[PDB]
Structure formats: structure tokens, C-alpha cells
Amino acid sequence: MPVTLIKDIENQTVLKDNDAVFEIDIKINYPEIKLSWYKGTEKLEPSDKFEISIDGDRHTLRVKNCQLKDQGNYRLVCGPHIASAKLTVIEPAWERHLQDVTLKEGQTCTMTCQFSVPNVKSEWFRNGRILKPQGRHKTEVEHKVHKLTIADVRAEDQGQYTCKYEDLETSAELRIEAEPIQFTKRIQNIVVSEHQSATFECEVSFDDAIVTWYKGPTELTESQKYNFRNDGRCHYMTIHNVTPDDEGVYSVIARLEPRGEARSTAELYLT
């Protein structure tokens, strides 16, 4: 037989800017027979892009600095034997991007993105500053998936989270919804005798809430008539010298950023 084939070429998948190597081991039994490499119609010749070499039965086509535009079929003819093989080139890139996530405080945050090359080393950033995997924050790479985990999220974790490989970034925002403020003890109706003082009292679920008190639609301010006291979660309004004009519906609105606000209503009566 004119030739004796031992291995043939195989498909090549390489990362962009790397070399690809197609090699065939073939014993040529008659000197006039030569192996030739082709890309489509062109017989390839040694150049800055293509290195062609021979070692005994081993013939090598090296494609230098592979680009996505180099992808396609590479083939050879060696007497009666012909063979073709495919070059695939992968550009490193973020295949699916970081997305915004919104969570309730206390939840576990999981943010993931997917790179085109598995097992690469990446760095995470919070608000532009590099993130170290400490304590509550953990970062991992699982094949192509890059994942940031933050346990027991609090409002202070809200911000920009970025994953970076070399100069390729993907980024998104983590937003945290704080537990809303509530009244743990609503104001309740009060009865006093005329000219006595009357003290409404309430309690909210968090300290240092800002309270505003009302009679009907009217905001009340500190005076000889209305005294206000706030102590941790408790809030009080005392109405001095209660007379019939002081009777009716009163309300309090408690506010604590970023936990919204809450409202409680009660009525004041004379005996």
C-alpha cells in the first residue's frame, strides 16, 4: 500500500490567541508522495500564521495565535489518504451576566454569573472595592459558574457587586429590604376627669423611631399643653388640663428609615 496510517488528525478546540496543532502520523512508502495541508482551496505554506513540520511519520500543522476568524475546516492530502478536521476557538467572555437581586434582610444572598472558560480565577468587588472571602461572604467557582454568597444580609450589604476576569467585568446591584417598623403596642382610648392630664403611650418594634402626633388632621407640637417623651421603643404624649375641646380622635405616626412608617389611632374622653 502507498501509505500506512497510524493516527489521523483530530478536531482541535483552543482558547483565543493560543496555537492549535493538527498532527497526523502516517508512513509514506514511496518518495514521490507528499502530504499537503489545506484550508479550503489553499495549500498551506509555512508563514507567520502556519508552521508545517515533519518528524518521521509525524506531520504537524500548527496554526499560530488562533482567532475566531480562523475557525473552520483544515484538511490534508497524502497520496490516497485525505482527512479533514475542525478548529474551534473560544474567546473568554461572560456568557450570562450578573443580574440585580432584591432580598429581605436576614436572607442568604446568592449571585452568579457564567464565564465561557471553566475554572478561571476571578475577583469580586463590592462598591468598587475588592471583596475578600471572609466571614459572611463566600466566593466560589464551579466549572463555568462564578458565585457570590452573603449570609444573613443586612441593609449595609446593598450596593454594586462585580465579578472580573482579566479586564472583562460583569456587574449588578444587590438591594436589601429592611424589616418594616410596626407598633408593638398601639395607642388606646383614654378617659380622664376634666383638668387632669392624659398620657397616650405606644411602643414600636425598633429604637429611635421619629414620631409625629395629631389631633384629628392637625400636627401637635411640644408646648405647655402637649409634652412628648421618647425613650428607646416607647413614645408618649401627655395632654395637660384636659377640657371638652381636647376630646376626640388622636393619632401618632412612627417613622424609621429605611423601615417605612406606621400609624396608630385612639380617642380621648372626659368622664
UniProtKB/Swiss-Prot annotation:
It comes from the Eukaryota. It is found in: Cytoplasm; Nucleus. Isoforms 3, 7 and 8 are expressed in cardiac muscle. Isoform 4 is expressed in vertebrate skeletal muscle. Isoform 6 is expressed in skeletal muscle (at protein level). Residues 80-175, 180-271 form the Ig-like domain. Disulfide bonds join 113-163. Autophosphorylated. Signal peptide: none annotated. It is linked to Myopathy, myofibrillar, 9, with early respiratory failure: An autosomal dominant myopathy characterized by adulthood onset of weakness in proximal, distal, axial and respiratory muscles. Pelvic girdle weakness, foot drop and neck weakness are the main symptoms at onset, but ultimately the weakness usually involves the proximal compartment of both upper and lower limbs. Additional features include variable degrees of Achilles tendon contractures, spinal rigidity and muscle hypertrophy. Respiratory involvement often leads to requirement for non-invasive ventilation support. Cardiomyopathy, familial hypertrophic, 9: A hereditary heart disorder characterized by ventricular hypertrophy, which is usually asymmetric and often involves the interventricular septum. The symptoms include dyspnea, syncope, collapse, palpitations, and chest pain. They can be readily provoked by exercise. The disorder has inter- and intrafamilial variability ranging from benign to malignant forms with high risk of cardiac failure and sudden cardiac death. ZIS1 and ZIS5 regions contain multiple SPXR consensus sites for ERK- and CDK-like protein kinases as well as multiple SP motifs. ZIS1 could adopt a closed conformation which would block the TCAP-binding site. Key component in the assembly and functioning of vertebrate striated muscles. By providing connections at the level of individual microfilaments, it contributes to the fine balance of forces between the two halves of the sarcomere. The size and extensibility of the cross-links are the main determinants of sarcomere extensibility properties of muscle. In non-muscle cells, seems to play a role in chromosome condensation and chromosome segregation during mitosis. Might link the lamina network to chromatin or nuclear actin, or both during interphase. Interacts with MYOM1, MYOM2, tropomyosin and myosin. Interacts with actin, primarily via the PEVK domains and with MYPN. Interacts with FHL2, NEB, CRYAB, LMNA/lamin-A and LMNB/lamin-B. Interacts with TCAP/telethonin and/or ANK1 isoform Mu17/ank1.5, via the first two N-terminal immunoglobulin domains. Interacts with TRIM63 and TRIM55, through several domains including immunoglobulin domains 141 and 142. Interacts with ANKRD1, ANKRD2 and ANKRD23, via the region between immunoglobulin domains 77 and 78 and interacts with CAPN3, via immunoglobulin domain 79. Belongs to the protein kinase superfamily. CAMK Ser/Thr protein kinase family. This is Titin. It comes from Homo sapiens. The lineage of its organism: Eukaryota, Metazoa, Chordata, Craniata, Vertebrata. The chain holds residues 9582 to 9851 of 34350 of the full protein.
